[PDB]
Design a protein around this ligand. Sequence first.
Ligand SMILES: *[C@@H]1O[C@H](CO)[C@@H](O[C@@H]2O[C@H](CO)[C@@H](O[C@@H]3O[C@H](CO[C@H]4O[C@H](CO[C@H]5O[C@H](CO)[C@@H](O)[C@H](O)[C@@H]5O[C@H]5O[C@H](CO)[C@@H](O)[C@H](O)[C@@H]5O)[C@@H](O)[C@H](O[C@H]5O[C@H](CO)[C@@H](O)[C@H](O)[C@@H]5O)[C@@H]4O)[C@@H](O)[C@H](O[C@H]4O[C@H](CO)[C@@H](O)[C@H](O)[C@@H]4O[C@H]4O[C@H](CO)[C@@H](O)[C@H](O)[C@@H]4O[C@H]4O[C@H](CO)[C@@H](O)[C@H](O)[C@@H]4O)[C@@H]3O)[C@H](O)[C@H]2NC(C)=O)[C@H](O)[C@H]1NC(C)=O
Ligand SMILES: *[C@@H]1O[C@H](CO)[C@@H](O[C@@H]2O[C@H](CO)[C@@H](O[C@@H]3O[C@H](CO[C@H]4O[C@H](CO[C@H]5O[C@H](CO)[C@@H](O)[C@H](O)[C@@H]5O[C@H]5O[C@H](CO)[C@@H](O)[C@H](O)[C@@H]5O)[C@@H](O)[C@H](O[C@H]5O[C@H](CO)[C@@H](O)[C@H](O)[C@@H]5O)[C@@H]4O)[C@@H](O)[C@H](O[C@H]4O[C@H](CO)[C@@H](O)[C@H](O)[C@@H]4O[C@H]4O[C@H](CO)[C@@H](O)[C@H](O)[C@@H]4O[C@H]4O[C@H](CO)[C@@H](O)[C@H](O)[C@@H]4O)[C@@H]3O)[C@H](O)[C@H]2NC(C)=O)[C@H](O)[C@H]1NC(C)=O
Ligand SMILES: *[C@@H]1O[C@H](CO)[C@@H](O[C@@H]2O[C@H](CO)[C@@H](O[C@@H]3O[C@H](CO[C@H]4O[C@H](CO[C@H]5O[C@H](CO)[C@@H](O)[C@H](O)[C@@H]5O)[C@@H](O)[C@H](O[C@H]5O[C@H](CO)[C@@H](O)[C@H](O)[C@@H]5O)[C@@H]4O)[C@@H](O)[C@H](O[C@H]4O[C@H](CO)[C@@H](O)[C@H](O)[C@@H]4O[C@H]4O[C@H](CO)[C@@H](O)[C@H](O)[C@@H]4O[C@H]4O[C@H](CO)[C@@H](O)[C@H](O)[C@@H]4O)[C@@H]3O)[C@H](O)[C@H]2NC(C)=O)[C@H](O)[C@H]1NC(C)=O
Ligand SMILES: *[C@@H]1O[C@H](CO)[C@@H](O[C@@H]2O[C@H](CO)[C@@H](O[C@@H]3O[C@H](CO[C@H]4O[C@H](CO[C@H]5O[C@H](CO)[C@@H](O)[C@H](O)[C@@H]5O)[C@@H](O)[C@H](O[C@H]5O[C@H](CO)[C@@H](O)[C@H](O)[C@@H]5O)[C@@H]4O)[C@@H](O)[C@H](O[C@H]4O[C@H](CO)[C@@H](O)[C@H](O)[C@@H]4O[C@H]4O[C@H](CO)[C@@H](O)[C@H](O)[C@@H]4O)[C@@H]3O)[C@H](O)[C@H]2NC(C)=O)[C@H](O)[C@H]1NC(C)=O
Ligand SMILES: OC[C@H]1O[C@@H](O[C@H]2[C@@H](OC[C@H]3O[C@@H](O[C@H]4[C@H](O)[C@@H](O)[C@H](O)O[C@@H]4CO)[C@H](O)[C@@H](O)[C@@H]3O[C@@H]3O[C@H](CO)[C@@H](O)[C@H](O)[C@H]3O)OC[C@@H](O)[C@@H]2O)[C@H](O)[C@@H](O)[C@H]1O
Ligand SMILES: OC[C@H]1O[C@@H](O[C@H]2[C@@H](OC[C@H]3O[C@@H](O[C@H]4[C@H](O)[C@@H](O)[C@H](O)O[C@@H]4CO)[C@H](O)[C@@H](O)[C@@H]3O[C@@H]3O[C@H](CO)[C@@H](O)[C@H](O)[C@H]3O)OC[C@@H](O)[C@@H]2O)[C@H](O)[C@@H](O)[C@H]1O
Ligand SMILES: *[C@@H]1O[C@H](CO)[C@@H](O)[C@H](O)[C@H]1NC(C)=O
Ligand SMILES: *[C@@H]1O[C@H](CO)[C@@H](O)[C@H](O)[C@H]1NC(C)=O
Ligand SMILES: *[C@@H]1O[C@H](CO)[C@@H](O)[C@H](O)[C@H]1NC(C)=O
Ligand SMILES: *[C@@H]1O[C@H](CO)[C@@H](O)[C@H](O)[C@H]1NC(C)=O
Ligand SMILES: *[C@@H]1O[C@H](CO)[C@@H](O)[C@H](O)[C@H]1NC(C)=O
Ligand SMILES: *[C@@H]1O[C@H](CO)[C@@H](O)[C@H](O)[C@H]1NC(C)=O
Ligand SMILES: *[C@@H]1O[C@H](CO)[C@@H](O)[C@H](O)[C@H]1NC(C)=O
Lengths: 240, 717, 239
Amino acid sequence: TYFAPNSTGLRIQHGFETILIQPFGYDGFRVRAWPFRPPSGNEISFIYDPPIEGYEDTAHGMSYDTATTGTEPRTLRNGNIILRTTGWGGTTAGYRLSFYRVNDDGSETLLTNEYAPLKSLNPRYYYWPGPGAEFSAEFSFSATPDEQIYGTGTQQDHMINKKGSVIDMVNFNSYIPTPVFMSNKGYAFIWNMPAEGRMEFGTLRTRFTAASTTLVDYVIVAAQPGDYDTLQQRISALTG
Amino acid sequence: YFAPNSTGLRIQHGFETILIQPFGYDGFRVRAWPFRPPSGNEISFIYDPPIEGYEDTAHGMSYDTATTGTEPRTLRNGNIILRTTGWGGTTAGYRLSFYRVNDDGSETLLTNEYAPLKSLNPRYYYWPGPGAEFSAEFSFSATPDEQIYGTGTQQDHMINKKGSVIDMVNFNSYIPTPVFMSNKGYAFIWNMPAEGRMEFGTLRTRFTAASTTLVDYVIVAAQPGDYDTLQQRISALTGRAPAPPDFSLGYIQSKLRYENQTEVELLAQNFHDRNIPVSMIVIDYQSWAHQGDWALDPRLWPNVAQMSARVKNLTGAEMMASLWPSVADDSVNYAALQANGLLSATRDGPGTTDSWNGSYIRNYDSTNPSARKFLWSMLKKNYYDKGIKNFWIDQADGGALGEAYENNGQSTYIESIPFTLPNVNYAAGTQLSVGKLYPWAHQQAIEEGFRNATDTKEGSACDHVSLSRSGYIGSQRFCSMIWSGDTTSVWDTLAVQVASGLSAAATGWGWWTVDAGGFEVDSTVWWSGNIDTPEYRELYVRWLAWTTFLPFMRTHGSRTCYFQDAYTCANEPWSYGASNTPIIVSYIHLRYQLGAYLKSIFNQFHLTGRSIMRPLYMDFEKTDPKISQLVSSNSNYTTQQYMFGPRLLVSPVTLPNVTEWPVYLPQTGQNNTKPWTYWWTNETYAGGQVVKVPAPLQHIPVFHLGSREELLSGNVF
Amino acid sequence: RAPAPPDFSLGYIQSKLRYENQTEVELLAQNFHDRNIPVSMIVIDYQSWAHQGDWALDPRLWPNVAQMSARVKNLTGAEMMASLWPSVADDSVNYAALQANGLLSATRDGPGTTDSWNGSYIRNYDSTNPSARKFLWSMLKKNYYDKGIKNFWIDQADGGALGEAYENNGQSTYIESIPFTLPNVNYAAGTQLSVGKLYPWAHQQAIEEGFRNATDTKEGSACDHVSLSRSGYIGSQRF
Ligand SMILES: *[C@@H]1O[C@H](CO)[C@@H](O[C@@H]2O[C@H](CO)[C@@H](O[C@@H]3O[C@H](CO[C@H]4O[C@H](CO[C@H]5O[C@H](CO)[C@@H](O)[C@H](O)[C@@H]5O[C@H]5O[C@H](CO)[C@@H](O)[C@H](O)[C@@H]5O)[C@@H](O)[C@H](O[C@H]5O[C@H](CO)[C@@H](O)[C@H](O)[C@@H]5O)[C@@H]4O)[C@@H](O)[C@H](O[C@H]4O[C@H](CO)[C@@H](O)[C@H](O)[C@@H]4O[C@H]4O[C@H](CO)[C@@H](O)[C@H](O)[C@@H]4O[C@H]4O[C@H](CO)[C@@H](O)[C@H](O)[C@@H]4O)[C@@H]3O)[C@H](O)[C@H]2NC(C)=O)[C@H](O)[C@H]1NC(C)=O
Ligand SMILES: *[C@@H]1O[C@H](CO)[C@@H](O[C@@H]2O[C@H](CO)[C@@H](O[C@@H]3O[C@H](CO[C@H]4O[C@H](CO[C@H]5O[C@H](CO)[C@@H](O)[C@H](O)[C@@H]5O[C@H]5O[C@H](CO)[C@@H](O)[C@H](O)[C@@H]5O)[C@@H](O)[C@H](O[C@H]5O[C@H](CO)[C@@H](O)[C@H](O)[C@@H]5O)[C@@H]4O)[C@@H](O)[C@H](O[C@H]4O[C@H](CO)[C@@H](O)[C@H](O)[C@@H]4O[C@H]4O[C@H](CO)[C@@H](O)[C@H](O)[C@@H]4O[C@H]4O[C@H](CO)[C@@H](O)[C@H](O)[C@@H]4O)[C@@H]3O)[C@H](O)[C@H]2NC(C)=O)[C@H](O)[C@H]1NC(C)=O
Ligand SMILES: *[C@@H]1O[C@H](CO)[C@@H](O[C@@H]2O[C@H](CO)[C@@H](O[C@@H]3O[C@H](CO[C@H]4O[C@H](CO[C@H]5O[C@H](CO)[C@@H](O)[C@H](O)[C@@H]5O)[C@@H](O)[C@H](O[C@H]5O[C@H](CO)[C@@H](O)[C@H](O)[C@@H]5O)[C@@H]4O)[C@@H](O)[C@H](O[C@H]4O[C@H](CO)[C@@H](O)[C@H](O)[C@@H]4O[C@H]4O[C@H](CO)[C@@H](O)[C@H](O)[C@@H]4O[C@H]4O[C@H](CO)[C@@H](O)[C@H](O)[C@@H]4O)[C@@H]3O)[C@H](O)[C@H]2NC(C)=O)[C@H](O)[C@H]1NC(C)=O
Ligand SMILES: *[C@@H]1O[C@H](CO)[C@@H](O[C@@H]2O[C@H](CO)[C@@H](O[C@@H]3O[C@H](CO[C@H]4O[C@H](CO[C@H]5O[C@H](CO)[C@@H](O)[C@H](O)[C@@H]5O)[C@@H](O)[C@H](O[C@H]5O[C@H](CO)[C@@H](O)[C@H](O)[C@@H]5O)[C@@H]4O)[C@@H](O)[C@H](O[C@H]4O[C@H](CO)[C@@H](O)[C@H](O)[C@@H]4O[C@H]4O[C@H](CO)[C@@H](O)[C@H](O)[C@@H]4O)[C@@H]3O)[C@H](O)[C@H]2NC(C)=O)[C@H](O)[C@H]1NC(C)=O
Ligand SMILES: OC[C@H]1O[C@@H](O[C@H]2[C@@H](OC[C@H]3O[C@@H](O[C@H]4[C@H](O)[C@@H](O)[C@H](O)O[C@@H]4CO)[C@H](O)[C@@H](O)[C@@H]3O[C@@H]3O[C@H](CO)[C@@H](O)[C@H](O)[C@H]3O)OC[C@@H](O)[C@@H]2O)[C@H](O)[C@@H](O)[C@H]1O
Ligand SMILES: OC[C@H]1O[C@@H](O[C@H]2[C@@H](OC[C@H]3O[C@@H](O[C@H]4[C@H](O)[C@@H](O)[C@H](O)O[C@@H]4CO)[C@H](O)[C@@H](O)[C@@H]3O[C@@H]3O[C@H](CO)[C@@H](O)[C@H](O)[C@H]3O)OC[C@@H](O)[C@@H]2O)[C@H](O)[C@@H](O)[C@H]1O
Ligand SMILES: *[C@@H]1O[C@H](CO)[C@@H](O)[C@H](O)[C@H]1NC(C)=O
Ligand SMILES: *[C@@H]1O[C@H](CO)[C@@H](O)[C@H](O)[C@H]1NC(C)=O
Ligand SMILES: *[C@@H]1O[C@H](CO)[C@@H](O)[C@H](O)[C@H]1NC(C)=O
Ligand SMILES: *[C@@H]1O[C@H](CO)[C@@H](O)[C@H](O)[C@H]1NC(C)=O
Ligand SMILES: *[C@@H]1O[C@H](CO)[C@@H](O)[C@H](O)[C@H]1NC(C)=O
Ligand SMILES: *[C@@H]1O[C@H](CO)[C@@H](O)[C@H](O)[C@H]1NC(C)=O
Ligand SMILES: *[C@@H]1O[C@H](CO)[C@@H](O)[C@H](O)[C@H]1NC(C)=O
């Protein structure tokens, strides 16, 4: 009785950047974005395709069902997670991402969306520091002051709630920063990137950065609140 | 005063040099650089010597002791002491730590360099280019209970910035400025013009610079709860504000936009015939022929000296005009600006920095002194010498043309395409290395022109003012007021503006204001900005009432309407319904009735940096024990209430259809009395409780300490 | 290995800057016919469009171009060639579509403009983007090829800036002489520094693909039509 998806993925052409959102595993979406040049195909990934456990029969790859330029809003549902493409500001469009969970009582809860209030930097920011095509990436997502962040690897901070902390993604003795975290809102998030960077768990914005990359890749999975054993069931099905 | 026994300490720690000097009262200045010494032409926003301090002359690079940091040392100036230490269990002197000597003799650690056993270097250097310029990341320790106030302006609805990351990139309504106070009893200034990052994490505070040749910061200590001294030290370091001209304290009429000369003359005729006082009429943008002409289009403003004189004859009001920093090819000044190198430019390609009005443009170089003087020669010829002697320096955030997206003026879809923000070339550096200076130097362009025409020195009494949307460290030194930028005309926006102005106060900015009623229409709220609907008419009257108790009372916005009889929808005190006209005019009269109180509190800000609009921790943290937590949680009682001067307590109504409003009256320190008097009922209440007062549409919840006749006299200090 | 050229291209090619409207072109063919002077191809130069990026003759001066090409072939038997620039301006009817589908190159920071011309700052279309090559042929085949103008003059497609070794083209020689750095723009195949030499080669390829698609012919076989290019690279003789 699983709410299987009706689309293999959505590919948005937003100017020079392409965003490929695909249903991935149970109650999960996989988002990939790149400016100008398509993925080489030799990028390093830490997630399984298809997931170790999920609704799928075969791997997704780059497959998608619908292509748009993001002029109009769209909606895609997989399991209990729903994606809603929207505009920025008062506009009605479909180049901004937002993720909801369908609760047991029929209502919906906003897990997170791309941090794009009226006056703010682009939630998918690209910057070219070198003469080549490799770029640095800064992706921003909304957050609430009451949110709680669990995981993010190991660190001697004497805290299990990582909210309000910045975690640099550079390894050294006793410090293994890993961008895999659970939120008490009922969702988990995987920044599937091997590049060094930064984890910002701010009061109103969650931001991940990549020092140098050719492709941004993350996965978001939803679960009913308080049910952390399912979140870990989904994370392990994605990463091992 | 505990004067220091050393002029400074210079540490040679490998290839990096650290120069720590006593600076002002209870302050230390720290400068560090790897390999190459400072050129001496770095951009600095602090005074040497401070405007007020123990010193007789400037410090410069002078120091008393030189060491390699092999052994620990101690240096004391005032109540702050520096202790150089090792890292880990080591005994050395290459790590910095700062303590305050309390009144009871004991000491409290303000902060040290974040260096636990396993951690990155608290002074991290990185070379991204082939040259010697470097990126810097400086880390300081922090505690989970700490509270951060200031950091500039932002629409975050918080006065406690703990747990937030603040990017140092300017855009509309967002002026990140690395000057903050901590509730531990110290202030900190990251004296750097480079773009970067502010990390106020749970256990680590980090500042970064994208490209620089020198790191420079100042730390100053004060006894806990005593924020008035922190602001006294900050203003002595970065600038003591001048006294504003008396006319600027009145009612400022503005909108988007008064389009031709005869429309402005009928506006003054309306204020005169209706016997409604007005102190300044503002002319908005798009009033020029081309971007960069810096003059009113004669086809719509044929005789502006006659216009300003007629406006002054009917209302006595002064005039203000708008200018943008962008110049297009169709400008009469484009060839001259291009030839003399007075324009910024992207570092490859044609050099255009953004777009507007269907043309791609280039911002003038405010860091170039020749460009600043070229621009005043236009403003003085076409405005100042023609009766318009106040200037609206709009859309000068720096880099792009005022927004966080490129291709301004085009479709919102194109604006949303993530074109990278430009790292432009300036005369003083690049956008990444010196970008934060651009709006600060733009204010300076008008300040230099003002002081030159009046033959007065900076810091003295102003004859005229400028209206700016951005700034930086020490922007309070100019005859210039900052406003919160483009806001939406909805109820939630009105509640968020308060915390932005309170954060500006903690940054050192006193001359702050908003757009009464908001600026932009919210397309998802059908009544937003509609001056003919009762829904927005209610919102505007609540908003206009609040601006009465702000450093500057000004109305402005881009309204919508059902009936239009001009170029744009109206925004005048008689444009919101017949029943609302007497309400708006009453607050206009009340504003002029507070003139003595306004000039008195603006003067103390000029002498001491005495904050004008005051967050509740500055006056009642020592007193009310409940306030420490109400600020930590960013309660509406602390993000939406404030002290306007030493006597008034203000709390705007931020909800529709409301007749009672809950105001938290803080404790004042006399438990057997009732010090709070409600303005509209004259009823007295005791401190330390939340009260629900009658708040009809015409009344804004305002309490006052002492007698009303004394605060109206100005004698409050 | 180069293809064999069409026989008509080996004759006399008449061109200048510039034949401005349709009636001037028709009187030119009438002159060759009345004087019995042979001509094999008539060329229409640039600035014959309404906006940069429209990729069509301005109807205010070329009202019926299918009739113009047919009249030219009736009087002289000559084929026709028209000019197109790779620049796109905001006033273009194709600007919104080119921007939304990512068919324009761009400088890597700032608004993205790559040069200037005709008093407007412009962006070059991305010849390395296969989708952009298709977009441009859909314009040329609609407004030229299917209307008797089946040879194309792909001018000012050197890559990076707009055809010159200086930025701010079309402006004063003093401004042009100011050493604004040549742009390291973003392409779909790389940057100007990493793949820039491909731009004019891929621009020739755009029309070669269009020519071979219309005639159902393989590249390298006999050509029915030609293109006039000012730049190229390794192996450009294959077109
Ligand atoms: C004291 O201090 C406190 C702070 O410390 C302060 O609290 C702050 O208060 C304000 C106002 O009270 C709060 O602001 C609101 O926040 C809401 C939540 O925002 C987030 O989530 C939404 C998505 O929300 C959808 O789904 C959830 C869950 O399912 C629902 O609960 C929601 O209702 C909403 O549902 C709709 O849309 C769904 C999807 O399409 C549908 O499925 C569903 O059916 C519904 O139709 C995100 O969109 C937000 O993202 C935005 O902001 C983030 C981060 O900034 C950005 O990253 C992102 O890009 C976006 O910009 C966000 O994540 C908002 O929903 C709410 O929005 C309303 O008002 C604002 C104006 O302020 C409008 O601009 C906005 O359009 C919304 O207006 C509509 O609804 C209002 C009233 O509800 C109507 O009046 C209005 O007409 C309009 O109607 C629209 O929808 C109607 C629905 O039927 C429809 O009828 C109409 O036709 C019309 O279309 C607002 O922003 C803020 O969060 C508080 N902050 C905190 C920390 O608590 C407090 O106020 C202070 N108190 C006092 C007295 O001062
Ligand atoms: C439940 O959870 C709770 C939280 O989740 C948890 O709380 C945590 O508990 C731990 C353990 O208690 C706390 O850790 C301590 O933190 C202290 C404060 O550290 C900060 O400040 C110091 C500098 O402070 C000085 O000045 C202040 C005020 O003036 C004094 O109060 C201090 O005592 C101290 O004074 C000395 O030095 C002064 C000047 O030099 C002198 O004037 C004075 O006379 C004193 O000699 C900073 O140095 C610290 O910085 C370090 O960490 C930051 C950030 O990580 C880095 O940036 C920086 O580089 C440094 O690494 C910090 O900012 C520490 O002082 C305290 O340290 C002692 O123990 C640790 C081992 O844990 C030793 O490694 C360390 O050397 C210290 O040891 C000395 O003193 C101890 C006992 O006090 C002796 O046992 C020991 O022998 C040693 O002796 C030395 O000094 C003696 C002084 O008399 C002397 O007699 C000896 O001869 C010898 O010289 C420790 O790290 C932690 O903060 C809590 N965390 C939080 C969030 O609260 C709680 O435990 C949990 N509960 C349970 C049941 O689990
Ligand atoms: C950037 O680039 C862009 C383009 O990429 C540049 O834009 C271009 O600039 C060029 C020149 O710089 C322009 O060429 C001129 O165009 C005008 C306009 O022509 C049009 O509009 C005419 C009238 O329109 C009005 O009425 C119509 C009625 O329907 C109405 O719809 C409309 O709203 C408006 O109110 C039309 O009549 C005319 O059409 C005619 O001719 C067509 C050609 O074949 C034909 O198709 C039509 O059937 C119709 O017959 C057309 O649509 C032209 O007028 C102008 O031509 C004059 O000047 C040129 C020299 O530049 C000269 O060679 C011509 O002979 C002509 O000269 C007459 O008047 C002169 C007075 O100035 C006079 O001196 C001449 O002698 C001549 O007149 C008389 O005697 C002679 C012989 O004795 C006789 O032949 C005449 O009939 C007459 O009796 C140019 O072609 C482009 O149009 C323009 N393109 C665009 C899109 O704007 C831009 O400048 C650049 N920008 C920058 C910053 O660099
Ligand atoms: C980018 O930005 C630029 C600017 O930064 C934008 O440009 C501007 O756009 C605005 C509006 O979009 C324009 O304002 C409009 O200007 C016109 C033109 O006005 C001038 O010329 C008039 C006619 O001139 C002729 O005769 C003279 C002889 O001297 C010749 O030289 C000319 O060549 C012409 O042949 C002239 O009559 C006007 O003068 C009058 O008013 C002035 C000022 O009060 C007096 O000094 C004069 O004495 C004289 O009375 C003027 O010089 C105006 O006509 C427009 O007004 C109308 O429309 C308004 C709303 O748009 C409305 O509020 C007005 O009431 C008025 O309405 C008219 O129509 C109504 C109903 O249809 C009638 O009821 C009413 O009677 C009247 O008929 C308006 O003010 C700017 O001019 C223009 N600026 C520039 C430099 O071009 C540009 O649009 C932007 N572009 C992009 C892509 O974003
Ligand atoms: O940007 C070009 C693009 O704008 C489209 O507007 C969208 C945009 O609106 C912002 C704009 O609002 C004006 O006011 C309008 C309001 O938009 C209408 O809803 C209302 O009915 O009428 C009022 C008055 O005409 C303000 O006057 C503008 O200042 C404001 O634009 C900002 O302007 C500043 C500089 O002044 C600039 O820096 C900013 O970049 C710019 O946003 O955003 C909100 C969307 O809902 C609007 O659709 C427009 O529709 C379109 O045609 C095109 O012109
Ligand atoms: O470049 C703009 C700038 O030109 C100034 O002209 C200078 C320039 O001339 C080059 C230009 O020549 C045209 O032919 C002119 C000729 O130059 C004149 O001497 C003659 O009297 O008139 C003819 C035609 O009217 C060509 O038609 C143009 O192609 C050529 O311009 C170059 O154009 C190509 C594209 O066509 C472009 O890619 C180049 O960037 C551009 O340079 O250089 C020689 C100087 O002696 C001239 O003074 C002009 O004065 C000025 O107003 C401005 O328009
Ligand atoms: C200066 O004073 C500090 C403490 O105030 C002391 O540790 C140091 O030895 C003194 N140095 C000199 C030269 O007096
Ligand atoms: C002041 O206004 C009155 C209005 O009648 C006018 O008579 C008088 O000349 C004006 N003075 C000036 C300097 O314009
Ligand atoms: C102000 O600048 C002017 C230049 O127009 C100069 O002549 C004058 O001396 C300056 N005023 C001073 C130095 O007081
Ligand atoms: C000037 O403004 C008045 C008042 O709004 C208006 O009636 C008139 O049409 C305007 N004139 C022009 C040319 O815009
Ligand atoms: C409140 O007192 C003031 C003077 O202190 C007076 O002007 C006002 O009318 C009083 N309002 C009342 C009694 O409602
Ligand atoms: C071309 O058509 C014309 C009629 O418009 C006719 O007189 C002439 O014979 C034709 N010539 C050729 C070569 O078809
Ligand atoms: C050429 O491309 C078109 C689409 O543009 C396609 O329909 C056709 O099959 C291709 N081949 C030929 C010979 O037309």
